[PDB]
Amino acid sequence: KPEYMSFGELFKNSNIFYTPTYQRDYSWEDEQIEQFCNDIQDALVKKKSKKSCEHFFGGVVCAQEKTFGGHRRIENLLVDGQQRLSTIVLFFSVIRNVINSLNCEEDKDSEYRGMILKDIYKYFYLDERENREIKKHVRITIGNADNEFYQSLIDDNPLKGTRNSHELMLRARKKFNSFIKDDLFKNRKISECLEIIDDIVKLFEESFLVIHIVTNSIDDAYKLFTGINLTEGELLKAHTIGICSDNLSHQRTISDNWDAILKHPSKKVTDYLRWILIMLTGNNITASSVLEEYKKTVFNELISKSEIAQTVAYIRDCVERLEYISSGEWPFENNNDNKWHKSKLDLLINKLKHLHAMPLLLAASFSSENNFKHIVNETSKFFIRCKMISDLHASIFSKLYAVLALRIHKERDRFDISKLHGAFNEILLDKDPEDVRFSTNVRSLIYQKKGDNKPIKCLLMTIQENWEWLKQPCQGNSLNRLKREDQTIIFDFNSMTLEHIYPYSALHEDKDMDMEKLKNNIGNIVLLDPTRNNKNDNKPFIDKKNSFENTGIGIHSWIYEQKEWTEESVKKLTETYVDAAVKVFSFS
Amino acid sequence: VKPEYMSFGELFKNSNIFYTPTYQRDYSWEDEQIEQFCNDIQDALVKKKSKKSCEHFFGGVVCAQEKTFGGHRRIENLLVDGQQRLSTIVLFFSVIRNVINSLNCEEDKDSEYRGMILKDIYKYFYLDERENREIKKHVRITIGNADNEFYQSLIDDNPLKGTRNSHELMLRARKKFNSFIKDDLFKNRKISECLEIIDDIVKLFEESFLVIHIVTNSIDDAYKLFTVLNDRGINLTEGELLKAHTIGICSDNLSHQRTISDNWDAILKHPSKKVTDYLRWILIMLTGNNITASSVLEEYKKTVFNELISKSEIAQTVAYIRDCVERLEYISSGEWPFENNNDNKWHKSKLDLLINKLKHLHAMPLLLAASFSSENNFKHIVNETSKFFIRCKMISDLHASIFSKLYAVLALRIHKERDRFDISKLHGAFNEILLDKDPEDVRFSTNVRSLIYQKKGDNKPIKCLLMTIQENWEWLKQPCQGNSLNRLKREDQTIIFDFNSMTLEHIYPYSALHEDKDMDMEKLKNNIGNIVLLDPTRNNKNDNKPFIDKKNSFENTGIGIHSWIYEQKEWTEESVKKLTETYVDAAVKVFSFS
């Protein structure tokens, strides 16, 4: 059935290729350039026996093809594949330059070299006659920052080179020379040497294929895979400037702000833009539709008052913050010690990798620093209960955080914390009526023999930090809990100690054969004190009691009181945990 | 100059029969995918009231082979990308069809506008194969083993009861489509108006909602078109693809097919990214030749899953692949892989640093191979690698390819040598790189020298440095011996620093009161020569006041550089210069492997 075409065919036909405006810099590194050569050689090797067909880079995606509006005969707005075609040309400039310097005394420069040279002419130029003049254009033109220098490389008279991409090209060529001269020519006579290049020419003609896909617009091409060449950032840079046509001032402001955004690499740009939008709109917009939604909501004509110019600058500022918050780091200046909350932000996204919260936090950062502080803290507690302890589907977070994120964006410092609780509370009533699913889970928590034990550690740590408020006689309201919570201790999971009250590993003297069934149950587990008290304990309860004498951790009191630790005392702690778990992870 | 497209309707007007590949992944769209599917419909409906309503959705339905000569129905299509979009159209029409089950016999529109629109839309559900004697109408979309049972039932409006999370998603999708047409669209509309929009719905899926049908040559090829950067409704990964290829080799010994099939099943439990990442890091370990993401499918096929290796080892490897995948589940998130009974907390903290705090994923093939070595060899690698990464990436900024070969080769050597590997190899390996990229330590040295305190960050670079010289201080001081193995033996493991509670003090004060504000010194204030770590426990810094009124901080403390600082009379530009050199010197010694 299917129709495929070789790379030669792409250049055989009268095609001219050119990149989009805002085409990203060349990005092929040695990993790509080696693979490009080794692909060749596998197929040279296979030549001796079996087939060399390779479906290279299936898909050279083109966005328009004007036969009367071309650059020369058929313009192609290359959306994906530019690198490959670009380098292929580069590679052939190397084949031409190596060959041209071969000795070639007898019947080669006379014959075979010239026959090879006409067959690759097509990778460099396309001749066209108007009357008596043979005007001839180049077959591929790359990004604006690069093209000038690339062309230089193809003319084998390179320019100096002003940036990374220029260099990345220079190395690929350096590598190509080594690949032909050293790795393929090796030790061979000119006739043996041409024979192998004639096979390279023939590979690109017959064996190396792609699917040539034509498309109606840049956006449609782009939609085929929603980012070596174009991100949403580049498309928005373009759209956004195109909106500010008359005002040549607003443009330069915008171009600059986008360039600062586009510096950062593909994945992070797109992910930031998504998060930013989710905030602004208050909807869990899907990855593909981000490009579309940006234009419908944030960048449009009713919108289009050169507010867009302001918004672009707002995007940058958001990006500058996200570089802190995406890596778990505090967005505000360091003076306020604020270490305890700083420890939460790190926990929340470096340790538990709860990125969903991002638009929340971003919007939070545009509120007050106290707000940010409380939002981070609480949003942890939520995530812990909801997905560390319970295993709810993450879609719980999607819609919740988006409205919140939006709320906070409008309300800023007049945003009040209580909104967060009610918000969290709603959701938790719906999915957990009487704090009964949360409870059953906390109850069925087992210590892990291999983990860092995040889920148990999160639970203990947090109740401990909200212990004082647990034992305050009445009300225990969540807003009071947030005012009267312990921030003096910054718990490190790496140095946290999780004690087995009935010992983890007991020998014959310690016995209790059917207490062994009980160990690992949460009820047989306490957070030891990491305050200077040093937890070098392996023994039975009676022996190891000094561990709980008069220490900073709340539940240690009642653990001391026990003359012995039995099946029943395990049940008695389990419920104490399960209880405070509920009061401490509930919201009002 | 005109490019080809086709609508979802044209797709279905032809005599197509769409099916998924074997092992096609479970249905994965959630409320954000469907809330978009719907908002797409209404905007086009709102744009119908003025301008054009064209819209290129899921451009790129990609089939793998075609047969019309002899078909189950006329034309059969193996879908490798598109299924999920096409499936929630069949779903969404089934929902319109039950919403035209609202007004029975009602006023000359049933046989006119309801019987008609039923048949104009009949096409998404069944394709009438008239056949030799008996009419055989088949369903026009099939979606791989897990769902198809439950799915077929739902469109019919005779739903089964869910057994998987996927089953719920479709059930939610149905339920949300219900609500849309009745509450968003039909909301106070004369049923004449209502039919008018149901009708104008089909017209979009006829004329306005386009795609690009691509026909590929093989499944591999269809997948190659997705080699780079697509993330929604993944129907396959290298994992699923590899399961077929590996089964296809181990077929005529069912013993292997069952053990194989169940392992990949266990593997393929994990979400696709983790799967393709894990698969690469293992291949790298198995070859010692770090290989482009874009080539993992093939390099698995001509290396560890070839025909000359068709020795039933294949099934043992696939099992091994799963051993690794279990391990990688821990290491990947910085969590210790061994039985954590034997405390080893300090090294645990270094793994969490390396993977969760500094994010040096490049190391996974190395870390993985080491986990198959002694837990000692593991301990030491995580340690020494964190040293090398701090040096090369956090302080210096050598480009990440440096690591790519270095680790690939090391991971093999560790895989091959196992528990009788010796650390001095890892040091040598590291040491060769530094002899190459930084022969006389001058690059690393100046980078250290020009480290500045950050007004906003966590200061991870300066912290990585001061903690690490701090932790190796009794070795920096000893009557000099200078051996990397020596350092490793003598190294302090008694404190476990938490970046969140670690304190960086400016020796000349951060914000100095004018009475104490020397101006030449301010040009230095944030330079590392004026920065020191503080005893985490014990003393806590709160004070931005002058050196002299501030000397109590260093007196009899746990951290070595304090002794010298205590000994000063004043804190001059000259004393700064001196410290810089000390830090530069400590670094060069603590961060080398000779």
CB within 8 Å: B33 and A286: yes
Assess if residue A132 is contained within a domain: yes
Nearest to A498 by CA among A515, A522, A478: A522
The chain A residue lying nearest B348, using CA atoms, is A494
Closest Cβ opposite residue B356 in set A331, A334, A350: A350
Q: Residue B223 phi/psi, 5° resolution?
A: -70, -45
Assess if residue B397 is contained within a domain: no
Closest Cα in chain A, distance from residue B293 (Å): 10
**DSSP, residue by residue, A90-145:** HHHHHHHHHHHHS---SSIIIIIHHHHHHHHGGGTEEE--BTTB--EEESEE--TT
Is the same domain home to B181 and B248? no
* Set of chain A residues whose Cβ sits within 8 Å of the Cβ of B209: none
Encoded amino acid at A12, one letter: K
Nearest to B27 by CA among B161, B174, B222, B168: B168
Quote the CA–CA distance of A415 and A408 in Å, as a whole number. Answer: 6
A299 and A240 in contact (C-beta within 8 Å)? yes
Quote the CA–CA distance of A194 and A108 in Å, as a whole number. Answer: 9
Is the same domain home to B462 and B545? yes
Quote the CA–CA distance of A70 and A60 in Å, as a whole number. Answer: 18
CB pairs under 8 A between A and B: 169
* Set of chain A residues whose Cβ sits within 8 Å of the Cβ of B455: 333-334
The chain A residue lying nearest B543, using CA atoms, is A335
Is the same domain home to A36 and A87? yes
Looking at A223, A254, A289, which one is the last position of a domain? A223
| C-alpha pair distances (Å), B147 with each of B20, B90, B153, B188 | 11, 14, 10, 36
Q: What is the DSSP letter of B333?
A: T
Looking at A160, A193, A223, which one is the last position of a domain? A223
Quote the CA–CA distance of B506 and B552 in Å, as a whole number. Answer: 14
CB within 8 Å: A1 and B215: yes
CB within 8 Å: A333 and B217: no
Assess if residue A435 is contained within a domain: no
B557 and B538 in contact (C-beta within 8 Å)? yes
Structural element, H or E, at residue B195: helix B191-207
Strands A15-18 and A140-141: parallel
Cβ neighbours around A21 below 10 Å, total: 14
Q: Residue B77 phi/psi, 5° resolution?
A: -130, 120
C-alpha R_g of chain B: 33
B74 and B15 in contact (C-beta within 8 Å)? yes
Tokens of A70: 């071309």
Cβ neighbours around A51 below 10 Å, total: 9
Assess if residue A31 is contained within a domain: yes
Closest Cβ opposite residue B340 in set A216, A329, A450: A450
Is the same domain home to A217 and A236? no
Q: What is the three-class DSSP state of B16? A: strand
CB within 8 Å: A490 and B499: no
Please, what is the end-to-end C-alpha distance for chain A in angstroms? Answer: 65
| C-alpha pair distances (Å), A455 with each of A485, B37, B225, B508 | 21, 37, 40, 43
Is the same domain home to B152 and B108? yes
Assess if residue B337 is contained within a domain: no
Residue keyed to tokens 């099992």:
B319
Encoded amino acid at B164, one letter: R
B154 and B169 in contact (C-beta within 8 Å)? no
Nearest to A34 by CA among B363, B366, B405: B405
Q: What is the 3-state secondary structure (H, E, C) of B53-92?
A: CCEECCCCEEEEEEECCCCCCCEEEEEEECHHHHHHHHHH
Q: What is the three-class DSSP state of A446? A: strand
Tokens of B391: 């040096």
Nearest to B38 by CA among B155, B194, B175: B175
Quote the CA–CA distance of B438 and B441 in Å, as a whole number. Answer: 5
Quote the CA–CA distance of B296 and B280 in Å, as a whole number. Answer: 6
Looking at B332, B361, B395, which one is the last position of a domain? B332
CB within 8 Å: B232 and A288: yes
Alpha-carbon dihedral sign for residues B382, B384, B387, B388: negative
Is the same domain home to A308 and A192? no
* Set of chain B residues whose Cβ sits within 8 Å of the Cβ of A533: none
Q: What is the three-class DSSP state of B210? A: strand
Tokens of B65: 């082979």
Tokens of B396: 């210096």
Q: What is the 3-state secondary structure (H, E, C) of A456-490?
A: HHHHHHHHHHCHHHHHCCCCCCHHHHHHCCCCCCC
* Set of chain B residues whose Cβ sits within 8 Å of the Cβ of A337: 542
Burial annotation B401-426 (CB, 10 A radius, 16+ → b, else e): ebbbebbbbbbbebbeeeeebebeeb
Quote the CA–CA distance of B136 and B447 in Å, as a whole number. Answer: 76
B89 and B8 in contact (C-beta within 8 Å)? yes
Nearest to A494 by CA among B344, B453, B265: B344
CB within 8 Å: A228 and B231: no
Assess if residue B404 is contained within a domain: no
Closest Cα in chain B, distance from residue A117 (Å): 32
Assess if residue A152 is contained within a domain: yes
Nearest to A211 by CA among B270, B496, B218, B294: B218
Structural element, H or E, at residue B325: helix B313-331
A458 and A536 in contact (C-beta within 8 Å)? no
Quote the CA–CA distance of B517 and B537 in Å, as a whole number. Answer: 30
Count: domains in chain B: 3
Q: A580: which residues sit within 8 A by CB, 6+ positions away?
A: A463, A466, A467, A470
A383 and A357 in contact (C-beta within 8 Å)? yes
B576 is in which domain, residue-wise? Answer: 448-590
Partnered with residue B77 across adjacent β-strands are B18, B66
Q: Where are the beta strands (DSSP E) in A226-308?
A: none
* Set of chain A residues whose Cβ sits within 8 Å of the Cβ of B60: 224-225
Is the same domain home to A143 and A86? yes
Quote the CA–CA distance of A417 and A375 in Å, as a whole number. Answer: 7
Residue A476's region, left for phi above 0, alpha for psi from -120 to 50, else beta, is left
A405 and A282 in contact (C-beta within 8 Å)? yes
Alpha-carbon dihedral sign for residues A256, A261, A265, A267: negative
The chain B residue lying nearest A325, using CA atoms, is B457
Cβ neighbours around B565 below 10 Å, total: 19
Q: A69: which residues sit within 8 A by CB, 6+ positions away?
A: A75, B1
Q: What is the DSSP letter of B161?
A: P
Quote the CA–CA distance of A166 and A235 in Å, as a whole number. Answer: 23
**DSSP, residue by residue, A200-225:** HHHIIIIIBEE-EEE-SSHHHHHHTT
Residue B339's region, left for phi above 0, alpha for psi from -120 to 50, else beta, is beta
Encoded amino acid at B311, one letter: K
Quote the CA–CA distance of B479 and A424 in Å, as a whole number. Answer: 61
CB within 8 Å: A55 and B221: yes
Quote the CA–CA distance of B168 and B174 in Å, as a whole number. Answer: 10
Nearest to A88 by CA among A136, A133, A122, A64: A122
The chain A residue lying nearest B31, using CA atoms, is A395
Q: What is the DSSP letter of B160?
A: P
Nearest to B395 by CA among B406, B386, B405: B386
Q: Helices A266-281 and A395-411, interaxial angle, to 10°?
A: 70
Quote the CA–CA distance of A196 and A180 in Å, as a whole number. Answer: 10
Quote the CA–CA distance of A456 and A498 in Å, as a whole number. Answer: 9
Assess if residue B363 is contained within a domain: no
Is the same domain home to A459 and A514? yes
Is the same domain home to B544 and B488? yes
Burial annotation B83-104 (CB, 10 A radius, 16+ → b, else e): bbbbbbbbbbbbbbbebbeeee
Quote the CA–CA distance of A144 and A159 in Å, as a whole number. Answer: 15
Nearest to A577 by CA among A541, A536, A527: A527
Is the same domain home to B90 and B188? yes
Is the same domain home to A492 and A546? yes
Is the same domain home to A127 and A266? no
